[model samples]
Target: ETHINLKVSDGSSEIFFKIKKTTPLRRLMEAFAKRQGKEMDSLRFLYDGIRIQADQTPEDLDMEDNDIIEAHREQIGGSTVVTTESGLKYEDLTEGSGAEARAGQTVSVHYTGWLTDGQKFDSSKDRNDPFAFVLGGGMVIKGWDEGVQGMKVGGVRRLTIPPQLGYGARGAGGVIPPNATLVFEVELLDV
Candidate 1:
């Protein structure tokens, strides 16, 4: 078997672990338990210093050679700001008159995608030509297929889709792991 060394930092503190190849994440937890004298079930592992969901699998995640895995407690806290008032919210970007033109219609659009933390992951707007897809068709995510309904042409909207409606518990490819909140700036070009 091979071996790997993992070093992780959580801004305030850090820890390191030397792991063996072919070792499941559970075994790594046992090692950590031994170090802290805690129950193996009481601990969890993260990666890239980010908190990982409980149901995630290392094998499914495809751990890299000499990869660094971080560890953290399951309980973590953060706040999300939801706009309820009248404003240009992601959820309301294609509202009112504009939505009238999008119902049961196919259209071309330019979009920029980002994580909840405002990190851009993809963008078609920068490519000059907008992409085309049938709104309400099965061409895109369930949220977009449903959310873009009733939108008119030449309108710009932001769609703040939750993990449930977006990628769900299991995210789309590696870059977008489990339960990730997604934000999209969508502009309707034509039908």
Candidate 2:
């Protein structure tokens, strides 16, 4: 059996495990969850920057010795109102009225961005200003366009953007790491 060492990080802490190449990742993930006293479903495992399935084996994923992985918490503290096929999740904090946002319309919003571990990365509120962008203009990430599409003025929404929708594998500058999922609390100020 080919034994490999794997490093798993949950943002706050790092844990290491040794397993054979043929071993299912679920076994390792289960042990990790148990150590944290959390259910297996509560965490999303990623290897080599892509989310991994529980049934996948290290050999199937081509994981090498000492490969690093991350375990991000699943949706928490919000009621999911919409889940897009691309994996974006939206939770409405406040109901909105009037016409929904559309392409060519200028939209203004105050937003705070955080990592899954609750680490703040960016915030318009900290700058004491709102950010304005054109709807569906490719000015922002795909997740923003999809998540803010149905929002109206004075609406408060939370967007859980998957890495594919946000910065993808490269991430955004140094603020967001590669393959990092983003959480945003956005208040639609105008449209």
All candidates: CA RMSD in angstroms?
16.0, 11.4
Clash pairs for candidate 1 = 46-70, 90-158, 98-152, 99-150, 99-151, 102-151
Q: List the residue pairs that clash in candidate 2.
A: none
Question: How does residue 126 of candidate 2 score in lDDT?
Answer: 84
lDDT tens digits by residue: candidate 1, 44-86:
5667646554345455556665676655432222323344332
> For residue 145, what is the lDDT in candidate 2?
86
Instruction: Give the poorly placed runs of model 2, Cα more than 4 Å off.
Output: 1-79
What is the Å distance of residue 161 in model 2 from its true position? 0.4
How well does candidate 2 match the true structure, expressed as C-alpha RMSD? 11.4
The lDDT of each candidate is 0.61, 0.84
Per-model TM-score, in order, reads: 0.48, 0.58
Best by TM-score: 2
